[PDB]
Amino acid sequence: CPLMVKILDAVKGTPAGSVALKVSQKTADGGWTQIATGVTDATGEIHNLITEQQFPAGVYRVEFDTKAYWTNQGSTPFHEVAEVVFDAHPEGHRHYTLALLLSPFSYTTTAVVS
Amino acid sequence: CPLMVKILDAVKGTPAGSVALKVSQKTADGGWTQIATGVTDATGEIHNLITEQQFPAGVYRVEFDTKAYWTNQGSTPFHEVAEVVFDAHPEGHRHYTLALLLSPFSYTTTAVVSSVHE
Amino acid sequence: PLMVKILDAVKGTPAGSVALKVSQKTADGGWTQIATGVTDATGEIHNLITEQQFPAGVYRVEFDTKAYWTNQGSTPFHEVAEVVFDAHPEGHRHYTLALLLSPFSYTTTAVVSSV
Amino acid sequence: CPLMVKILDAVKGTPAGSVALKVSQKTADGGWTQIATGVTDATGEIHNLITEQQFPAGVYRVEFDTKAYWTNQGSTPFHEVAEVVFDAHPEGHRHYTLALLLSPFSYTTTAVVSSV
Ligand SMILES: N[C@@H](Cc1cc(I)c(Oc2cc(I)c(O)c(I)c2)c(I)c1)C(=O)O
Numbered sequence: 115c116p117l118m119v120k121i122l123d124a125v126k127g128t129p130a131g132s133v134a135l136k137v138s139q140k141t142a143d144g145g146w147t148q149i150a151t152g153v154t155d156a157t158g159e160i161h162n163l164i165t166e167q168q169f170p171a172g173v174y175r176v177e178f179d180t181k182a183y184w185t186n187q188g189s190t191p192f193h194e195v196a197e198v199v200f201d202a203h204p205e206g207h208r209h210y211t212l213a214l215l216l217s218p219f220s221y222t223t224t225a226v227v228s
Numbered sequence: 229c230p231l232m233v234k235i236l237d238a239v240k241g242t243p244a245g246s247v248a249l250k251v252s253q254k255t256a257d258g259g260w261t262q263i264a265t266g267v268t269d270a271t272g273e274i275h276n277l278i279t280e281q282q283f284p285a286g287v288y289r290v291e292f293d294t295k296a297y298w299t300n301q302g303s304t305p306f307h308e309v310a311e312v313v314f315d316a317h318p319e320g321h322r323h324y325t326l327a328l329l330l331s332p333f334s335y336t337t338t339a340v341v342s343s344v345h346e
Numbered sequence: 347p348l349m350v351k352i353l354d355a356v357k358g359t360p361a362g363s364v365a366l367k368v369s370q371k372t373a374d375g376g377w378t379q380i381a382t383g384v385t386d387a388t389g390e391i392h393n394l395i396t397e398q399q400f401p402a403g404v405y406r407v408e409f410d411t412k413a414y415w416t417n418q419g420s421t422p423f424h425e426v427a428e429v430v431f432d433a434h435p436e437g438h439r440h441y442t443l444a445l446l447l448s449p450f451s452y453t454t455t456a457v458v459s460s461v
Numbered sequence: 462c463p464l465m466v467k468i469l470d471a472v473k474g475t476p477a478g479s480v481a482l483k484v485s486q487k488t489a490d491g492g493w494t495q496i497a498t499g500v501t502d503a504t505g506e507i508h509n510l511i512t513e514q515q516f517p518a519g520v521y522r523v524e525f526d527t528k529a530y531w532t533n534q535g536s537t538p539f540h541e542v543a544e545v546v547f548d549a550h551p552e553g554h555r556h557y558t559l560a561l562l563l564s565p566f567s568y569t570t571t572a573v574v575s576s577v
């Protein structure tokens with residue numbers, strides 16, 4: 115599990131369950147190719163999102179459907195989506211955890227790189 | 229003003245109006261002495277909270293009544309109070325803005341000690 | 347109508363010289379560039395766009411945070427910081443995009459004035 | 462474990478190791494009584510901080526020595542300490558994780574309440 119997510123709901127103080135996300139890798143011509151999708155469980159995580167094989171060095175984009183999450187909770191949110199874009203160097207069993215803290219009009223994207 | 233606040237409500241996307249706060253200074257014996265109280269206006273600010281003379285170097289504590297704010301919003305807050313404790317160094321016309329981002333189960337306390345970058 | 351306030355959470359000052367670009371979502375799901383700019387020393391950009399240039403629709407503001415950290419001598423996590431949102435500037439509605447930066451974290455908040 | 466912490470360093474992108482903290486419970490007269498102290502491990506956590514028996518409902522204050530953490534890192538911190546003060550409601554096996562995100566001039570205190 116070289117790419118992990120942890121999404122928290124800052125209003126409820128619980129992980130954000132059922133958040134749809136997708137992972138894209140930057141291609142040679144500068145475009146994006148989608149390599150995985152998933153939805154967070156009740157713990158705000160997604161296990162086995164991608165494998166080491168799918169996660170070579172490069173630039174990646176994780177897009178979180180935060181709007182749907184808030185719309186479903188009954189809140190009108192600001193952001194259409196939450197985008198996390200970063201260069202990955204996973205060569206060496208390097209784990210990446212994308213922590214995301216959500217409020218209707220704010221989010222925090224932090225990274226923990228082990 | 230040597231000490232300003234800017235409180236934002238991350239749920240509504242507006243400044244947090246009518247947030248009560250108190251400013252205390254640490255005394256020589258380790259206790260706290262309250263030197264100002266106030267309540268944010270609709271912009272999430274408090275003008276003329278304290279003067280330069282009331283703000284010598286020392287340890288200060290700014291306590292925001294975020295629990296009452298959330299209770300009044302019909303929400304369920306986690307924190308009893310939001311507390312910002314810092315050693316103030318006002319020498320050299322250094323002014324402080326305490327930025328505070330509020331959500332019921334989270335707050336962010338940031339400080340801005342210069343109006344410009346360097 | 348659109349304002350930004352970028353703060354540096356390491357230094358406790360605004361983030362100056364941060365490059366950004368403002369794009370507007372097009373019918374077919376694409377983007378059109380409406381403005382570019384660079385924050386001044388107070389971490390703001392004045393007269394970024396005008397009222398007529400900011401009609402209802404989805405906008406994307408890209409902040410070149412990677413360059414900012416690089417110039418500051420830090421190695422950052424994010425390749426860029428993107429803020430994407432539905433804008434409804436009808437009336438007096440002004441938008442402030444507040445951005446709090448650390449090398450391995452940022453917080454994007456919005457302050458939206460009523461009418 | 463009814464009370465856990467998770468501290469991250471937003472400058473380095475790692476958990477914040479070796480952060481000193483103290484846990485106190487508010488008394489009937491509005492004073493404080495110390496119930497635990499500890500230091501985060503390399504994952505930014507402290508295992509077995511207190512027991513369920515030591516954690517009845519009431520107001521608690523967790524003080525984190527962030528100033529020392531930043532001083533040790535060679536940085537210049539703003540805050541003299543980071544305090545998280547909250548009325549704890551552990552009934553029905555509810556546990557608390559105090560998440561803390563640290564930058565020299567900013568921190569975020571969030572709480573995660575779970576039925577574990
Ligand atoms: N048992 C885990 C420990 C762990 C608990 C939490 I909760 C966590 O989550 C956050 C999420 C956000 I979003 C934050 O802003 C912060 I600070 C901490 C992370 I990452 C790690 C482990 O295996 O290490």
Ligand SMILES: N[C@@H](Cc1cc(I)c(Oc2cc(I)c(O)c(I)c2)c(I)c1)C(=O)O
Nearest residue numbers: 234236327328329351353442444445446457
């Ligand atoms: N543009 C204004 C200046 C200004 C606007 C805002 I809004 C602001 O406040 C915050 C509050 C929080 I909480 C944040 O996380 C951030 I980033 C910025 C500050 I300080 C200054 C003017 O000069 O008129």
